[PDB]
Amino acid sequence: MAIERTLSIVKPDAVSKNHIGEIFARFEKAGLKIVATKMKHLSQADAEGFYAEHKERGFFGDLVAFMTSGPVVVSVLEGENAVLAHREILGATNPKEAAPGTIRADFAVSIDENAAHGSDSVASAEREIAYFFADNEICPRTR
Amino acid sequence: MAIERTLSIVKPDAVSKNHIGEIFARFEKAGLKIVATKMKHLSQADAEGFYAEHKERGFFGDLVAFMTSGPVVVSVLEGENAVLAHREILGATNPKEAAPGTIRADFAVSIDENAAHGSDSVASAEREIAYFFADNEICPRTR
Amino acid sequence: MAIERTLSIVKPDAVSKNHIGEIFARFEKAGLKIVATKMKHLSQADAEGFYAEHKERGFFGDLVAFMTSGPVVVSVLEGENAVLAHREILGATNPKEAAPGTIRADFAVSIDENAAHGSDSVASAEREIAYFFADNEICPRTR
Amino acid sequence: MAIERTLSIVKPDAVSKNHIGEIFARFEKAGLKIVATKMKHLSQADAEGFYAEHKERGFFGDLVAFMTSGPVVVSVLEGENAVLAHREILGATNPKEAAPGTIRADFAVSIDENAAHGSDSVASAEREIAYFFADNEICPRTR
Amino acid sequence: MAIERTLSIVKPDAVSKNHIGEIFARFEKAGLKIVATKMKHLSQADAEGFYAEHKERGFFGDLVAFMTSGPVVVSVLEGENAVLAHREILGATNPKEAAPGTIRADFAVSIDENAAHGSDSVASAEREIAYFFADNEICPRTR
Amino acid sequence: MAIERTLSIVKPDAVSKNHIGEIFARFEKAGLKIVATKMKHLSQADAEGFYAEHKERGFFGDLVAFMTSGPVVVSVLEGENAVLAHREILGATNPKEAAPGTIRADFAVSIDENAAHGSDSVASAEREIAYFFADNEICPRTR
Amino acid sequence: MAIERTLSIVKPDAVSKNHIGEIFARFEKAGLKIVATKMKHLSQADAEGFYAEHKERGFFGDLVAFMTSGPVVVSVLEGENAVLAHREILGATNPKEAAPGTIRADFAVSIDENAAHGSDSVASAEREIAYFFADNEICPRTR
Amino acid sequence: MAIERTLSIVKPDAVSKNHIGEIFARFEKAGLKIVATKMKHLSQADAEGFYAEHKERGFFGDLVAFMTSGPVVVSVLEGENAVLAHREILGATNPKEAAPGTIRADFAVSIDENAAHGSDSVASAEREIAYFFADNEICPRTR
Numbered sequence A, B, C, D, E, F, G, H: 001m002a003i004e005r006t007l008s009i010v011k012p013d014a015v016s017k018n019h020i021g022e023i024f025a026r027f028e029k030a031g032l033k034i035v036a037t038k039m040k041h042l043s044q045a046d047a048e049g050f051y052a053e054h055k056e057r058g059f060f061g062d063l064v065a066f067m068t069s070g071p072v073v074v075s076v077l078e079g080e081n082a083v084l085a086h087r088e089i090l091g092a093t094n095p096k097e098a099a100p101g102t103i104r105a106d107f108a109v110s111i112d113e114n115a116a117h118g119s120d121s122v123a124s125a126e127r128e129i130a131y132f133f134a135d136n137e138i139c140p141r142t143r
């Protein structure tokens, strides 16, 4: 219905196995537009800051360790219903539970190493995007 | 032979038509690794600075105009023989002259709007990479 | 059982998709009576005050942002075992975990945007009701 | 055509029989948005003030007595052609004369106890809304 | 000593003779801060609800009749020792017994029409404040 | 002449310095009657809505910032020639220009922090009152 | 009272005359901490985006032209009451109106070329900071 | 004689004590121009990469620890004989050995915490600048 933006992260597993292009191709085939992107290697503090909502959960340590183990690609995706649409093409967080043709089904090895992140809601998306990107960095399509 | 780095630019034509994923997939299928990447919208000065060696040639103004007409994606690609290997998968600068299966053959409309740039040599690659990236931004694979 | 009161909030997601009537119908079909109700758009301070117990948690920012993103409906529900009965009809906080026929199963998109809030206990209900309603506002059934 | 606002009252009969949700659902199914709502128990003076134009009519006393006999829900509904659209879904004032599927046909017992009120015109709607609501209380949809 | 809150009511006698400002000025001169206030005309039920503990006493009917005879102003006062300090400036309940310079001495005509109410204890103050005000309505000082 | 109503706001400066009583006393001494009043802390949106006529002026941002910096008291004053009479007792908008004995002369520090607002005309008064008050909230004098 | 953040811009005039250090020294002497900073040359689009709220105003074009005429320094300042404190040391927007040891008094030539920008409110500061900085770029003091 | 560029770092000690402006003022007073600047908090890897020439020295660990203990400011300074001129105003590496009026004499506590870094030669300056800055980021003076 309305045009939204959501954060994508290609996680270190998918980067290390050179799945960046294939994952991006799925987003673009589904009508999502890449309006910002950059490769980063997160420090402990960068990852802990991004995942601050899970600070008290049992998996926090392993999440941070995995997300700092290698470079990631962080992107802003724009389109109609972008938050939920991105979520549908990612599939279930647990890859064994994920529908066929989704990113988790096709590229994820396990729960921990599940290839990619997507924002869970519009509110989360704004916070997530703002964490990695200044508004001035986002490149609307002209041309 | 030995591990090199080369600059890739996905030009505004290919960005506007959402070919970023498909182009990146070709690089990765060929064994090149993306070790830095960012989406930018170049200003007149940014483009003029990158193309400064051609400041006095007749095509300069049109090149700058095209390369500032929409956002681009700038990347560093790493691999064995990366400079020439990247060039082979790009294909001939002129898309009507380009081999089938290359990026120019499949995504370029004309000479002017030829989808992507690649560094022509190791020496030009060093200069081109340093133009867009600080050494500290480049993310070697650790995982 | 004994007659209790509990707080309901129809959250901004469910308001924006015009589910207010359908949600209220479920409460009333189950024998809960609406004895106070009002539509409000919470300010940052109003939401932070209601959720003050989670002030130090990592999700606090996103919770406040979501709960101030659009108008809500706040209500007092009265009935036999109203606190737990309301909880049963809401279903599990996580909609993917929620039983069929519950509000979360039928109207919630995600954990973050889960359609509605209900008081978790009699003690929390007293505090939550008093936060939004003066005792003088509550309209017992005469008639 | 143009976006309007109209007053709805769910009268004490429909409140006492817990039809609030079902009535609201009909408004929302028809594309009307609830942009303000509150439950009140009207005093004699509150009801007399709202119905002041009929002060000299023979039915005035009965009307006031009925409208003060139990709590009501007062709401502002917004939408395209909201005044007439609301009227169509209410149906004829007399429930025995009302079309099937309307609120009067399905929830009203008699002329006197006819479940709900709707503003008759844009001009009456402005006056009626202003009677129960400050402009600052009305919650436009932002999400 | 500690910061407290107490309920003030300017009763209908003092409102009708336009003493609201002068009474408020006395509170503020004594170092009490007005953190919530509203003018209301209590219905029979509103007054009976506030005075519910005295429902079986002989004076109940006259109290309710007086407190519904005209509009009142209800307020929350905040300050050091606010409950007792408010009581000192009100003076004795019986105005003929009240110290000079108190509100009862200067504005009350009789026991029945004694200008103002103040909470008698911290416990009664909590109950009385909650009767007229939601916690969300109270405006702490932010300057 | 004729009985009018006008809006008064005691601004956050005068509230924070506990001048509410003294200001109200001046209104009442001049024969104006307080027929509605409430303390509020305005949000950004509430203040912007009230001051919408100055939206394009250079001072708008500072006005909104000041009027949201702390709680205010909003009131309806009734009396003969209430709009102009209220204006006379307020005095000139600029306190250095204001006559002695007026509210601006006695309580205002500067143009920006000028203690109180009054409606400038009958037409603005209708709009301003309706913004903060439902007609049903206004309390006519009955004794 | 509370720790805030505000945006500073050292404008092209003050950069061109090498006043960056002297301006920063004044901020730091006043107890403000520089927690993010970068030198940029704004494009037309960057400046238009930052000033988007004034897009329809008469001065818009001149503002954009001046703010793109040379490089600027953009910074986040942190401290107690940082927004207003920053404003006090900047002084009045018009340098001829500005108090003696303020930045406008000492470094500004005219209204147009007034040396520096500061956020006008907490709300504007949040938006302005987010325009130029990702949250991950801001460097809180450790150490 | 010729225009050069050199890297400046304001180290975490000088940042933490808010000496950034005073240090910058000294550079600018000496005729050096700030043509790029940014505040960063270096990770272990960022610092180790910059100081890679000292990787086998005994002090390497302490250098890295100190340079990652808080945020730094990294800058490019441009001017006549910039490398040596910058070195003269820094003064001797050891602050007890440093001439009066130099940065080390006035702001350094010890050898380890010596306030600032400057490139030692034109060759080291090229490498150091390129480490932190893309050529595209450097802002020549226009205007």
Ligand SMILES: [Mg+2]
Pocket (backbone or CB within 6 Å): A120, A121, A124, C062, C112
């Ligand atoms: Mg979330």
Ligand SMILES: [Mg+2]
Pocket (backbone or CB within 6 Å): A135, A136, A137, A138, G045, G046
């Ligand atoms: Mg931009």
Ligand SMILES: [Mg+2]
Pocket (backbone or CB within 6 Å): B135, B136, B137, B138, H045, H046
């Ligand atoms: Mg690095």
Ligand SMILES: [Mg+2]
Pocket (backbone or CB within 6 Å): C120, C124
């Ligand atoms: Mg709990």
Ligand SMILES: [Mg+2]
Pocket (backbone or CB within 6 Å): C135, C136, C137, C138, E045, E046, E049
């Ligand atoms: Mg009541």
Ligand SMILES: [Mg+2]
Pocket (backbone or CB within 6 Å): D135, D136, D137, D138, F045, F046
């Ligand atoms: Mg409002």
Ligand SMILES: [Mg+2]
Pocket (backbone or CB within 6 Å): E059, E062, E112
């Ligand atoms: Mg008696």
Ligand SMILES: [Mg+2]
Pocket (backbone or CB within 6 Å): C045, C046, C049, E135, E136, E137, E138
């Ligand atoms: Mg509140």
Ligand SMILES: [Mg+2]
Pocket (backbone or CB within 6 Å): F120, F121, F124
């Ligand atoms: Mg006007």
Ligand SMILES: [Mg+2]
Pocket (backbone or CB within 6 Å): D045, D046, F135, F136, F137, F138
């Ligand atoms: Mg009324």
Ligand SMILES: [Mg+2]
Pocket (backbone or CB within 6 Å): A045, A046, A049, G135, G136, G138
């Ligand atoms: Mg951080």
Ligand SMILES: [Mg+2]
Pocket (backbone or CB within 6 Å): B045, B046, B049, H135, H136, H137, H138
């Ligand atoms: Mg540039």
